[PDB]
Amino acid sequence: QPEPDMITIFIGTWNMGNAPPPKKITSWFLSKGQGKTRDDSADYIPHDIYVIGTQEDPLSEKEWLEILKHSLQEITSVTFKTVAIHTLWNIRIVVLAKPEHENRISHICTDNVKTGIANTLGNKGAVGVSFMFNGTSLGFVNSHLTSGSEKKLRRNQNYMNILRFLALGDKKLSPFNITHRFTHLFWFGDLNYRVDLPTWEAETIIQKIKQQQYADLLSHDQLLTERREQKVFLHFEEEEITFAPTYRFERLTRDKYAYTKQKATGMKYNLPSWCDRVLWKSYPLVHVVCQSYGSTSDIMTSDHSPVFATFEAGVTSQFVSKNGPGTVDSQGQIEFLRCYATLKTKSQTKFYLEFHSSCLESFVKSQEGENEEGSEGELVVKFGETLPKLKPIISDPEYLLDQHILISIKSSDSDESYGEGCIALRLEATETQLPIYTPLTHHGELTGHFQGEIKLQTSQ
Template sequence: MNDRWYHEDISRPMAETLLAKAAQDGSFLVRHSESFEGALALCLLFENRIYTYRIFINEDNMLSVQASAGIKPKHFLKMPDLIEYYKQENSGLVTNLRYPVERVEEAEGAEVAIGASNVVDSTARIRSDASRSLVSETLARRLEEVDTAILAQVPRGFHKALCDYIEQDILKDAEHLNSSSVDMWQLRLLLSLLTKGLSNELIQTMSALETSQNLLDNQPSAGGSMQGQVRDYEPESPDADVQNRHVEIAPVFEVKLDSFGIFLKIHLKVDIENGKLIVKKSKDGPEEKFYNHNRILQLIKSQKFQNKLVIIIDSEVKKTQRKEYVFTDSKKREAFCQLMQLMKNKHSDFAEPDMINVFIGTWNMGNASPPADIQSWFLCRGQGKTRDDTAADIPHDIYIIGTQEDTQGEREWVDLIKSTLKNITYIKFKHVSNKGAVGVSFMFNGTSFGFVNSHLTSGSEKKLRRNQNYVNILRFLNLGDKKLSPFDITNRFTHLFWLGDLNYRVELPSQEAENIVEKVKQQQYQELLTKDQLIMEKNDKKVFLQFEEEEITFPPSYRYERDSRDIYNYIKQKATGLKYNLPSWCDRVLWKSYPNVHVMCQSYGCTTDIVTSDHSPVFATFEVGVSTQFVSKTDPNNAASPGTINFTRCEAKLKTKSKTKFFIEFHSSCLENHVKSADGENQESRDENLTVVWSSPLEVT
């Protein structure tokens, strides 16, 4: 099979010129598509018009032509097979393929050496066929001689693919080369199959090597890349409006686009101001194409490969178009997604956002004055799950800052926080304080938020007292809607965040101190976290029931030598003798949300450059879904049709022998008053428990 029809990267006008010169219905050629990355274009001449069909490759490396409506796409493993199929009549194209249009250099060569290609020496042909057969047999024999132990380590299907290529396809590639072709289609498809997914593994390995390099250089990673930094964003003055500041954030992301199983390097730029996703071949090159914000339908993050992202785009040709990109690391992907969300929010047709970003910071200040510069805390720079530099300057919608052991005057500390935040975003500020625990709550549209900042009892041996501190806060902290006061605070909010110096320690003997420090230096955090008191108590359902916490990937935040983050000062001299404070994750952020609501932790870590305290400041950021959940009961347009909830049957099992009659009370922010049911029917069970049944329908309006 000759591939004279393949023209690689010629332009569309050049292709049209060649087909016009051919001037025969059924003349065709194949080139790379200019409007769809990774696709080919099959150009076909019929009745003085040129029809273009795009050739796509799916995730199984199967080729298919975008055919006429009503024709089911047919898939092919090899490009020559596809061409042969569409040479048949009524195969789905406007006409069948008949006359391949040669490349320009081939046509010129034919004119110079006219007639030479038709003269073939029969003896030479026989020798050539024999040589090719010998090559195929030799390679097949070499493959058979490969050690079986090595073949056992090869992924399933690889050995068969190599055998098929040697037996069937290598001669086709040889024919292509003999006909002056520069493209070996069969080898290209084979390599695409064998190396599928290899690029992802290489990128992940590079990311791991980058982290190791930063560790060895004693330079905590702040989201940099071995493949080059994205341009920095210089914020405007503190008084500038936050919307104007968003406009300036326009980093360029280097990504790889999956095309025919081969990853092509391109660059993506999120133009927040104009609402466009721009595609460029080089970082500083011109714009190749763009997608408006309203055409970007969905972002799908791969769970298997943390640096892979699929973008679903509304297409004029097809209903949707799927673009698969691989970023240099997972933090770059998250930064890109945050910028895309910012762009969508800015240009949304809705009056209210459906997603907001929340920053939460907690810091035990150790009864010492803070440094003048604490900006790294609010920019999530340090160790752990941190924000990429390209997203660090994106302001959050809500900032929650909790501190403990703060001896500064209220005014000085508030002024420092306000001056720091004004360098990042426009703010409105509210300050509350208390000893032990303090909380704040509010409604955002129809979504309720609660935040608790607490400082629990210290001391490794006082775990049970900390548990009791937690229970007391649940009982006595007055927070949230008064209509929900019969419930503890963990059930009053759509989203409840709990932060502070919770003081839970790593429960290991004091003689393990040096071993703990060594494991921290080696970043073997997960082994130490199996002995973390908070995780163990939470797993035993003693505290923080149904709360979540992001995976901890940063070092213990306590107890450091002041003015250093290289030394843990875990021995303290007291009048009663030596006291050990083993390195521990005392400072934490947890959250609890209603089921099936969107909340995603985007960062969780600690700073490395704020060293005035024996604790490191801890930060966490969240992407939180918000919406208007309930229809207003005072709206006259809704007065005729109030919302109702019907319970067809309710059943409760109680551990009691009491004969008391029981009823159900319904409390909700959307109810004007609580609703009380009729008494249930008591039914004794064999296990000495009491079952209460409400068989009549219950209606809550």
């Protein structure tokens, strides 16, 4: 039986509003309702992996896993296996996979992060799951961020705390946070960003929603505006939104948005908003295609509607050769030539690089670079042709051209990373000097750039 080179992944996010679900939730897993929906001819075809994030989830793990498994079995006639389940108070992530994938999935990790201090600590935060699927690392984050139209900056803070502190994936990747540890990272949840229009416009907004005229509303969505100003989710993607706002509904219908201030809301307005979102970030030049992104119309127990997204995701096989794993393949080499980092830092330490990759036996430390002043005020760290020649464990181009090199630039004085990035080995040519580039981030914010040339030798 050949190993797959593609899988499909279902992402669901649903803020359940502390209510049990209705008896039928199959529309969710079928990507049926509003937005970019899945074709009827696919309804019996199981996704490879289902990742369900809930918020305000009132059920036990057992109660929810029985509902999920029974739902998928009814759709697909497949009994899914549980990869992982992790709950932080009423925030939960479930990962289910087809039985044939059980032997393909390993290195399963779970973690959570609680956001806030004192007053603001006790119910918001994130859960996450990571694992290997053959040669491919996958990470999944379900976050419930701070509520309220006025609190976008708090949400942005919650995002940075989650990507700093959530401990998933390979712990040897110590300079790297979750935004660099996975081939594919999916981040979803009740992100709680609102449509930032005046309160007095509530009925106008409702009118626009009834006319399915979302364009002007989306131009005021706080997550899209914060992302466009590089305040949050830097280097993540989101599919175009073509479904109505998923919050705040009167329960047991979808005919009414309940936006007016009430004692139960702390006297806050909840104008119709796209609270419930799915974003992703994949390594450069890896196949990832969103095939659905929408909301259900028939699940009405909560004041939120469920959101679905589905993806094609490229995956690679576990590779064994006669040499690696457990030695190098002297036919392979990676040379980084005429490289320089451009950093936003005002520090004057010396810097060294680390190169991390599952195509190396272990990470490689460079010599210190040569610091110069950039003509617009910046630090430029030059590495010349001084960089260590990297020795991959396998030289076969069918393996090596699918790999990635993570780069950290670290202070000699403190050994702290000032920036992290990723270079694809999916080159136009081997044995040929070719331009490379990555932005560098630290704690998910832009700190610089790395650019230069690469020369890749494979067994071909």
